[PDB]
Amino acid sequence: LPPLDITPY
Amino acid sequence: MIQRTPKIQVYSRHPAENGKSNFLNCYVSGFHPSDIEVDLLKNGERIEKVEHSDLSFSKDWSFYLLYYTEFTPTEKDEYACRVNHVTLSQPKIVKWDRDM
Amino acid sequence: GSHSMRYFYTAMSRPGRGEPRFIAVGYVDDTQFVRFDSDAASPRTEPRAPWIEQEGPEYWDRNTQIFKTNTQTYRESLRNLRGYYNQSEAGSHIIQRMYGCDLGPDGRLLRGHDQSAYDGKDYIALNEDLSSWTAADTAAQITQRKWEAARVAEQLRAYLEGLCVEWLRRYLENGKETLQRADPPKTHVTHHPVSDHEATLRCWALGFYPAEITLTWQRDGEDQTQDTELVETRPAGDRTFQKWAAVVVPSGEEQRYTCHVQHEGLPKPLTLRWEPS
Numbered sequence: 355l356p357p358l359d360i361t362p363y
Numbered sequence: 364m365i366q367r368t369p370k371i372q373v374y375s376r377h378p379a380e381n382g383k384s385n386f387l388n389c390y391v392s393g394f395h396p397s398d399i400e401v402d403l404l405k406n407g408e409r410i411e412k413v414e415h416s417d418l419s420f421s422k423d424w425s426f427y428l429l430y431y432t433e434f435t436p437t438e439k440d441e442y443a444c445r446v447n448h449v450t451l452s453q454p455k456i457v458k459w460d461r462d463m
Numbered sequence: 464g465s466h467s468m469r470y471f472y473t474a475m476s477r478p479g480r481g482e483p484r485f486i487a488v489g490y491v492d493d494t495q496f497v498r499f500d501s502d503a504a505s506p507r508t509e510p511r512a513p514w515i516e517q518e519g520p521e522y523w524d525r526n527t528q529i530f531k532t533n534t535q536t537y538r539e540s541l542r543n544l545r546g547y548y549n550q551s552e553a554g555s556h557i558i559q560r561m562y563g564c565d566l567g568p569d570g571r572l573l574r575g576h577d578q579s580a581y582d583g584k585d586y587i588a589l590n591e592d593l594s595s596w597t598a599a600d601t602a603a604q605i606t607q608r609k610w611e612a613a614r615v616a617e618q619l620r621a622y623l624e625g626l627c628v629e630w631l632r633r634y635l636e637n638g639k640e641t642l643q644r645a646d647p648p649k650t651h652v653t654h655h656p657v658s659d660h661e662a663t664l665r666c667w668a669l670g671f672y673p674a675e676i677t678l679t680w681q682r683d684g685e686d687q688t689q690d691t692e693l694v695e696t697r698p699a700g701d702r703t704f705q706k707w708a709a710v711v712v713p714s715g716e717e718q719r720y721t722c723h724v725q726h727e728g729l730p731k732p733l734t735l736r737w738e739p740s
Contacts, residue, residue: 355630356470356487356526357622359533361613363540363558363579363586363606365583376699377669378651390697395583396557397475416698417488417498417511419471424559424580426473431700462655462665463694463707 367425368450369394373443373459379436387434387459389444392427400447400454401430406440436461464573466492466642468631469563474537476545476556483541485534490563491634491642493673494702497526501534512702514638544581547602557582562589562619564627566635575623593620645728646672646703652722652737656714663709664737666722670703677725678708687720 369391376386389403397418403410416429434442447454469490476483488511489497496512503509508526510516540558550556559580567573577589587596587603587610594616598604610616635642648671655663668676674696680687692709699705712720717737724733 355522355626356489356529356533357562357619357626358529359536361610361615362536363543363609367583370695372694372697374697374705376701378667386700388697388700392695396555397473398555417495417500418473418486419488419490419495420473420559420561424583429698429700462653 365395365424366450367393367395369399369446369448369455371444371446371455371457373457374463375436375459375461376431379461381437382435384433384435386431387442389430389446389457390427391430391444391446392421393425394427394448394450395425396449397426398449399426399428401428402445402454403430403432404443404445404456405434464565464567466566466631466635467563468627468634469561469576472533472537472558472560474541474558474560476538476541478553478555483534483538485530485537487530487533491631491638493704494638494642496634496638499526499530501530506531506534512638512641514641515634517637543606544602547605558586559583562623564623564631566628566631570628570632572624572628575620575627577619577623589616589619593623641672641702645726646670647726647728648676648724650722650724650733650735652735654717654737654739657711659714661711661713662717663711664717664720664722665707665709666724666735668706668724668726670699670701670705671726671728672703673727674704675727676704676706677723678706679723679725680708680710681721681723682712682716683719684721 370393372390374388403413410432413430413432420426442459444457445454471488473486485501487499488495494512496515497508498511499508508523562577564575565573575593579586585599587598587606590597596607598607648668651667653665680691687710690710696704696706722735
């Protein structure tokens with residue numbers, strides 16, 4: 355199960 | 364902008380026995396960027412029912428893919444893998460050798 | 464560690480051709496179990512191992528929601544990076560991210576990973592302490608500031624130490640039969656005459672799992688590390704691997720060469736030789 359990638363680079 | 368030329372390996376899933384079904388594999392790796400064109404050839408002609416794995420990569424950031432199709436080996440037919448990538452002026456052709 | 468879980472993300476922009484593409488694949492050791500591609504007929508999470516299919520609809524919907532969102536987050540990221548580096552919106556670019564957790568002997572987190580690369584080169588990575596970053600260049604430092612202000616490190620540590628390990632243990636259970644059994648290689652040596660003076664002795668290691676393996680050719684017990692030609696370990700296509708070590712020897716002296724094989728699924732190292740038929 356992956357993490358929610360909410361913050362862009 | 365990094366650019367890495369792909370490594371090609373054509374081989375069968377099991378030791379080749381003329382007449383018995385097997386799988387022809389073309390493993391391309393160590394490349395970058397991801398755009399690549401791979402074809403499995405049978406006597407120069409292009410095989411159409413070819414499948415492949417999903418795009419993945421190694422610690423060094425280079426990609427790798429496995430293209431394969433079902434085939435029945437026979438000493439009268441020549442199989443090869445053709446790979447085109449931005450680092451190649453002409454598509455590289457790697458012939459399948461039963462011993463490698 | 465004894466077992467690991469990794470996710471490999473590839474986001475690529477393609478000016479003119481369409482909006483950015485996002486692909487994500489998951490691995491438990493050397494086995495891929497899921498895949499998502501925002502370009503497939505229906506952008507959705509698909510199973511790649513049989514044991515992951517025993518998960519209910521909730522699981523799939525959950526993964527798909529995370530990925531669909533990620534697809535949008537990455538599109539914004541590409542645009543942001545292009546700006547940092549003063550790049551033309553006419554060139555294709557790629558962001559790759561890899562992360563995962565390593566399970567120690569005690570069933571707890573051993574190491575957490577999170578590394579990003581822009582166009583094949585290191586961009587930013589989470590340090591072993593799981594609380595600090597390492598930016599490659601000044602552009603990566605802009606990202607570092609954002610991520611520090613947004614406390615991304617804390618969030619990631621929470622994930623790697625908790626959710627990652629928790630789920631890794633579930634997968635290792637569901638697929639116990641294949642994920643925790645080391646498959647030893649089927650071996651055999653072949654003989655190929657190059658000329659009437661020399662011949663190639665090729666030692667094969669087929670159908671083994673995991674990929675890690677060591678093949679060595681020896682002459683009278685002496686390791687021929689210098690003269691051996693090894694191909695990179697390659698996938699067989701059925702979740703197992705293949706590899707061969709070749710050495711060129713003089714006709715007649717072949718009786719002095721032995722192949723040494725090392726793999727964890729073996730009680731001790733194997734030692735073979737070519738047997739004339």
